């Protein structure tokens, strides 16, 4: 029932994601010199360094907000991919599966702690 525990749990999950080779295309903002039309397709860029910095700045109130930004990294990859078989998009799918598998208990524990707090 610790309402604050999600933050360190998210820091540790971000550390695992940064060690994962599949996260390399998503660690920093997409380079517009490499992908000149990126902002014509993607309205809201997102990357894991921005998520980590937002968390460390104390600018997430809950793990649901962090989860919405991580999911935006994956939906941006899906929206920008020219093919469902592209290398970078395939890396995003594996990374998304790993993220979803690990964030599920973080979200459940937070929501349970908050319900206990408001009982
Ligand atoms: C295949 C889809 O492409 C992406 O997801 N990108 C990762 C971020 O930088 C641009 C390329």
Swiss-Prot record:
The modification Phosphothreonine is found at residue 44. Disulfide bonds: none annotated. Transmembrane segments: none annotated. It is found in: Nucleus. Expressed in myeloma and epidermoid carcinoma cell lines. Residues 1-106 form the Bromo domain. It comes from the Eukaryota. The modification Phosphoserine is found at residue 90. Interacts with IRS1 and IRS2. Interacts (via bromo domain) with acetylated lysine residues on histone H1.4, histone H3 and H4 (in vitro). It is linked to Chung-Jansen syndrome: An autosomal dominant disorder characterized by developmental delay, intellectual disability, autistic features, anxiety, hypotonia, obesity, and dysmorphic features. Probable regulator of the insulin and insulin-like growth factor signaling pathways. Stimulates cell proliferation through regulation of cyclin transcription and has an anti-apoptotic activity through AKT1 phosphorylation and activation. Plays a role in the regulation of cell morphology and cytoskeletal organization. This is PH-interacting protein. The gene is PHIP. The chain holds residues 1316 to 1434 of 1821 of the full protein.
């Amino acid at each position: 029932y610790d309402i604050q525990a999600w933050k360190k749990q998210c820091e540790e999950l971000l550390n695992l994601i940064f060690q994962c080779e599949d996260s390399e295309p998503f660690r920093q903002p997409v380079d517009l010199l490499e992908y000149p039309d990126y902002r014509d397709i993607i309205d809201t860029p997102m990357d894991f360094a921005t998520v980590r910095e937002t968390l460390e700045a104390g600018n997430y109130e809950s793990p649901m907000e962090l989860c919405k930004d991580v999911r935006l990294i994956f939906s941006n990859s899906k929206a920008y991919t020219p093919s469902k078989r592209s290398r970078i998009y395939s890396m995003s799918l594996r990374l998304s599966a790993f993220f979803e598998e690990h964030i599920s208990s973080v979200l459940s524990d937070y929501k349970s702690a908050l319900r206990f707090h408001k009982r």
